[model samples]
Target: MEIDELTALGGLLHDIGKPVQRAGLYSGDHSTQGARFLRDLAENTGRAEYELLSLFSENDELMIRRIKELSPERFGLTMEDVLNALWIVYEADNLASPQASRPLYSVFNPGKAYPWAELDFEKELPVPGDVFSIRSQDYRELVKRLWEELSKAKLRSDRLLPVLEKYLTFVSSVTSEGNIISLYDHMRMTSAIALAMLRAGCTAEDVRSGRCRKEKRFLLIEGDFSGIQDFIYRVSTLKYLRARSAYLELIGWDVVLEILSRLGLTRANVVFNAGGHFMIIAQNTPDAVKELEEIRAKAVEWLYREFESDLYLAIEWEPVSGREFGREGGKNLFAEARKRLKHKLTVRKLKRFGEIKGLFECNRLVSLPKLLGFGRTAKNDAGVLVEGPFSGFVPYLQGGRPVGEQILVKNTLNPGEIPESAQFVPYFVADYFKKDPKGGVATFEELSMASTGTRRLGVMKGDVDRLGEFFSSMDSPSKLATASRFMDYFFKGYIGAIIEGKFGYIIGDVPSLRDWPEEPDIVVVYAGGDAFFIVGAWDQIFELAFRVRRAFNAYTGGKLTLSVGLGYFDERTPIYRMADVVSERLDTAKDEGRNRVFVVGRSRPLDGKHKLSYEWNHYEELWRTYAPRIYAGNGRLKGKLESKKGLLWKLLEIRELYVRDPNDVRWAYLTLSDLFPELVGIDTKAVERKEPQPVYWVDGVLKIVLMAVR
Candidate 1:
């Protein structure tokens, strides 16, 4: 391969060196490294059709070795053929690697054979501080110099504003008005274009300022085939996992577990559905519902914004049948919509190119954080464990008797007696709709609500009724089954409600908890690609046992078995009671058993192992006997949340958008209030308060706290 005209010349010329630039000089092995470097350059250029060039002299050892095997006539050496091939390689390499200044031809200077500077090559390389390290510290120290000193000519994309403007104009036309789906598809296409541009040395511009200024560009897939492959593979894997039923079901379970763990609540605000029609369910609590809704909204937005193009481009074209037309309201709707778009797109594409950059920059992905646990007890201050006071929200009565049965407050108090349908709206909140100062509000200026990208303002009642019917007729056989159905109905209702309710939905992305020091109700574990879980606790392990056994009883008239587990605290109780207990319980629950709840105190060696039995239900009896008398009507729920602080802050901030705007204020408040209900709505139950403990240096542990509002 090296003897080919392309490689032969490159290999022979690569070693051609120069004068010792300064005083240092070492030429012993410079030529060899040069040839090897050029060889690597050939493979990465993405143009692999130049392997036929055969220009090399007999003097070059590397070329000659390969040439000896081929006939002299075959090794036809022509300067023009070799130079052209070299130039092609040089251009390809330069285009492929923007950061590297010198082209491949820089290595082929035969004029001045300079001595290589050698100060123990291997030792100098292993010295660890300079080029071998990540971005040099010295270079970093000159930040301003680097940005300004680099000439604009050297930087590509000099006339970026015009292209960006064109992109903005096309995107804005598609996204600004028309059918909601068209907006969605357009946003996704634009974002995909941005991502593609990012891969092709395009930097994100600060369009927020309204001026089209381009930044120094950087490529995402910079000469690393492995990195590109890995990224593509992972994206494919996630898409596949999302598409499959069983895989999605498992991922749903994982999401539940993760969210429950992070929230540090007995229940989690959860959602488990995907695609254009997604379903989501979370507790009625502001945080939980908000989290779920936010996630739902974002997922819808991102999916539409990021992959719609890939979807359109990849899908096999199928002609619309008469049945499809009937379902989609026939050609009348299509014709009128198409006519409007054609008129707008034709002239607008050219006239408003650079002026509308800021319009499209407004769209963004919104995600919410998990619930932070409150520190009511010193033990609870540490982390959540299935053992200790952490296991029970309401403590046992005198003599250690169990408390009454507990129900997820949010689920029981959902907006209406039944769940609602899903209807998703674009999440583009007009700037004018934001809260105004001086106790004034902004008026809504109605934009076009008709077109492919826009939906009619109001929701359809028929859809909601049908959605209700879907949930009303279910034959659930167990608690988990009912719970699962409830979840299914719940998510379906929320997702359906977007179209039915004529509102935008919020969706929350769950994170991980592996790196967290304390246990949360729902753990957003970032390490595992933002996987989440929803963990629950009962008065006694037995209560959990009974709940799981009896499962979901009435509500839906389903016989469901709640497969439950208990995490026990085997180690010393940490200062943060919630922390230590939850962590221990979570670990135990995840391990040791399945289906039944376990208690640390009654936890016996089951077959010489650690598994709880059906007998765990006995613990619930104690809770049923004492819970109502001890903690009734949101006792702990009221105390655990900081409400007074919330009221104070609400008074200070003047939001006119909700009060004066023509948009849905109730919907806005409903979503906002639902997400951070704890921030404003106080949980004021006064339980047996733990003794105040001072923090010492060695014993100090971070506790979940409320942010002080201005």
Candidate 2:
């Protein structure tokens, strides 16, 4: 392994303590805990065996220091190597911090409203009047401050100076207003930036001596799983929820790490895995593609032999020429690669994408003899031996045990080495099994019981609107990488946190939703890339859907949008079917001109009559007008209206009438006046004054009211 691979390992482990801190079980700060953990890890895994372990001795004072205080004096025993590794961690951490993207004066989380301290600038920097702006002078000052901090590690900032400036500018120009530079986003972007610098710096040095080769190229490998949903949830039993999720995750993890192992990609190479999809960067050559095809063939044979064609994997790849690996072109390569990978989806269209070359089945059906062992042994009392690339994944079939790396199972981080990025896999699976005080994986009845009064569960599926167009609009690789990075943060990282009680901070004004189930009833069947599938309490899920959109709008500065489909299901509905049905509903929303949602009651038929389909903004406005009032215990109009018997029925009749004949305003007006005297004045005053009183508002308002009351 080289410096880049070592850096990637550090980046993945840097925040190992965050999860511990979040669990409220750790006494020390996350960084201290992280350092302590690594110190112990160095001992656990024979220091010289791993490059990362050798970066520090057990007694290295820097290993125990806070991340901010990490320096060369106590840590850089190997000079350049140690400093480079530390710089990678430092830069990745800072870039992921909220202060990097938002003005220090502004609060990153709306619910908390706790603003971060601004950069301690010695000089006055120009400020833009707009909501967000990046002044060159201001950015340079920030970079200088960063350099001064890292100079403690003996990092030659002069060499990295121009590259750092280029990195910030590229991110700033392409990122929309609404996107947050999340931890995961930071890691992905840093990978791109660090690699670009390494490649450019090398080419420049080589070209000066006229030793550069024009034929060299870089390749990106994108892999995705087909039949993932069917394979994982098809035989859904509450008994195996955790096991099934864990099994699926390990399968994907094994595929990605194994592929990376074959390519010998170090931390410098970019590899992002989320849900069932994964991407990797490698050197392009005839040998590379052949190796990938061989891996694909072997993996297919293994999966089919073990699971009998239950799952399939697809891989798409494209090359970037030597020129494209330069400063200008290197940044855009990731985007170009992703776009190419996306098109491969169409090739398979219905069965997930696959290679026509590997259509045949494995001649020998085999199985692993032992659980959790990454080896190919002869058959014995343990079990039948499986001959395939991913024999290591066989342990997943048995479920329940800390198979592979044990960091995910234990709260403490340690030295045992595996695919470090695969750390998040098991934790994600554990969340599915995690239960509230009452029970595990809430049933429809449990959701109904927790949902104040709404007697339904929420199943929402969403996708980024015109995502391809956005990808295509990126004129350069840098723009594409930045944009893609931003989207990944939203879909993969931010959305999951929202489900885990970070919603109020992301998009406030969500009455009672702030305390909506401390241990959420929600299950993230899958959430990543440009789409998501989530199931939870009906009202909470509905509120979350709106909050996500609002937060996304604010983050993107209204430049991008999401289309959602919400379906309510009861205890009787099957979990597997829920995903398919919700996905279909999401498609309906997309069909109704993107940036809308199609929400329906479970008991309602799919004849379009029970559907509440409209643009997201329309729903936002409706919530603004009636939600607080409907939820209001003391609102004069709301309480009075709810107390009036048959009033909802009367309003429904009026809505039906208005739909059939909007010009029949008198009849609708008369009915509202008679049934809802408190609302007539506000409802009709706009009409009398010829103001913008959306007559169409009545239909949506009534629907929301019905949902709230019953």
Candidate 3:
């Protein structure tokens, strides 16, 4: 009546057959072939990772007659034991799959399939979207590699996902034919649904009997850590900026895992955790639901006490039966669930301490000497202060407290940290530095001083555009999970490389003049999920926005867009005020239609044209043509454009013309561009982005160009 391991385990191992059968290891379909493989694996290993399942055997009848199958030399699972777990995984598979056998169509094009060829990440193109073949040789090679990784992979639910993600990401989930629904994503979704169904207090017998499908079985939980802007930027000193920001992320992570640990879930249950926003799939059981509320308040209570009400974690959930999670390939029911989650969060957000109040009942804001911070400052080894002398919890990575005395953490074990007594909590940070690279983290004052013209810091913040629409395009939870992981990886994993000047495949097809950000002075204040906030040298920061946008388009196959903003200020600006100005500018980029960046300048392009957003492509198009060569790629007095001020001034003069006339837009170019051949010692034929309308685009770059020149 009550079972957990087999159900959760079955979900993870269920479609593993897709790879085995396609590798031609067995002639039978994936399910039968995978089961036999699982049996052999369990037979040799003494136990299995999750456990084996049982169903569908003509061998059962023959085995009964043979009798050898009935007798085992060692005490072990009865022949019937296999029937419990695998059967539900098989049941859940079809429940999650379309009623008809699911297709392994091309990922980029739903109807077609990938060509039967060796997997090639670099050469893979989405445009090759036609129904196609998956060769046995290619599949065999993939499976062999998978075998090595999976064999050595630790036998824990939590330990397996990043391994699977590393190997299974590009392969298909189920194939009547091409590797579709990235095997990793499919398995994750499959595990979540099976676990959700089981968690809803349904018996293994119930899942097998199909009774669970008819009832509300899953809860989609969302937890958003609000007031991050306040918490991250309110530090008293330049030294505390990264310390405070990093601490908030760790606190949010600890809270996330605590929910999973108490509720008997793993990272697999987590749908996504971006920055401070997260979602999880949990059982709709009284225990799970009631415990979630209790856990949310405890985290909020701790955060309120230490951070002093500067943070609120709005955690809420919505329920759905198995059907809405793609059983019927249903749409919009998920959207309906999302609405309630948001409303609950909104309701909770308004109440602030109202949602978690016991700590305040006796006396509000009375604890003056006790509240402390979580960790030490990297540069100073200083205890972060909340009260005059008290520090929150300064965890030592090694030689630390015993397990009974230590709190286990779910994310980030930083380098130079060790786990002595199951002391697993570690610090994960995007704390990339610029000056004296390996020495000490730079001050924002230092970042500003490194700038070309304004000698000020620039805060650039942006997030994915049409994020909900991008998510809506998914037909299943697995697809949503995969897409979310891909986006999160870009910011957390890949965005740093771009900031450090590691990517030069600039968005446009122009000749490469020089690597951008000659003095790469940027600090990734935070980057995760769909959004990021960056602080860097003023010019380099502005320069990086286009680079990140370009890299994002390529990384996502141009399926989604990013909107960004840049706000530059003198080194004296407050961290809080910097966030204030840039966040508003970022909002402006999104509001004036997306896929655009509103370049926030202290003044107009010559005080001739007012500010407005420019299409990302258009801005880059003009920058490559006009700015790089003229400016000193090394940032000095030798700028070609700086020396040739007359020509640079001439172009800025033309953009002012576009401002005056709505009609005959070409008059500035028609009348003035011809004179450029005589006035400047340059060929007029190279200026192809010539329409006066583009003068607006050209003018935008010229504004930044002038800033650097100063």
For lDDT, the strongest prediction is 3
* Residue 586 displacement in candidate 1 (angstroms): 6.8
What would the per-residue lDDT of candidate 3 be over residues 1-710, giving only the tens digit for each residue?
Answer: 12454456567767777777777787686767776666655565455432233222113365344323434223254434444444455556654542112334543345554344332222332222435455667768767766665565455454455556645665667555533367777777777777666556565577666777766778888988888888777555345666566666656666666677678776677778777888888888889888987887777776776667787888888877766666254455555566678788898888887755475661111111111113322213343222111123343334442222223332332112322322233223344557545466677888888887668787888899988776666656676776677667677666766766654644444212234654477887788888888887787788778778877776654667898878888888778888888888878778767898877552233332334676787666666666554556544434434456776676666546555552344534444334233323322443453322344455566667666767
Candidate number with the higher lDDT (1 or 3): 3
Candidate 1 TM-score, true structure as reference:
0.19
Question: Which stretches of candidate 2 lie above 4 Å from their native place?
Answer: 1-213, 232-245, 306-310, 325-341, 348-434, 473-486, 500-506, 511-520, 601-612, 628-638, 659-699
| Prediction RMSDs, each to the true structure | 30.5, 11.4, 7.1
TM-score-wise, the better of 1 and 3 is 3
Each candidate: how many clashes? 128, 15, 9
Arrange candidates by TM-score, highest first: which order?
3, 2, 1
In candidate 3, position 669 carries an lDDT of: 45
Best by TM-score: 3
TM-score for each of the candidates: 0.19, 0.62, 0.79
Which residue window of length 10 is worst by lDDT in model 2? 119-128
lDDT of 1 by residue, 1-710 (tens): 22222331232222121111011132233333333322333344422221232221113354544544434344364433333334333322212111211111101121111111111111111011112211223223222222222212111111211122111111111111111111111222222222222222222122222111122121110000011111122231111211222222222332333333333221211211221111211112334434433432332233234333221100101111111111133344222322343354344334322222333560111110111111112223233121111221222222332222221111111111111221111010001111223322211111111111111111000001122223223211111112222233322222212112112112111111111112111111000110111121111121212321331221112222233333322122221342334335434543543322333323122333223222223334333332322222211312433454353234223122222331233423432243233223212331123211111000100100111011
Residue 130 error, candidate 3, Å: 9.5
Candidate lDDT (C-alpha), each = 0.22, 0.49, 0.61
User: For model 2, how does the per-residue alpha-carbon lDDT over 597-631 read when each residue is reduced to its tens digit?
Assistant: 77553222233333346687666666566555445
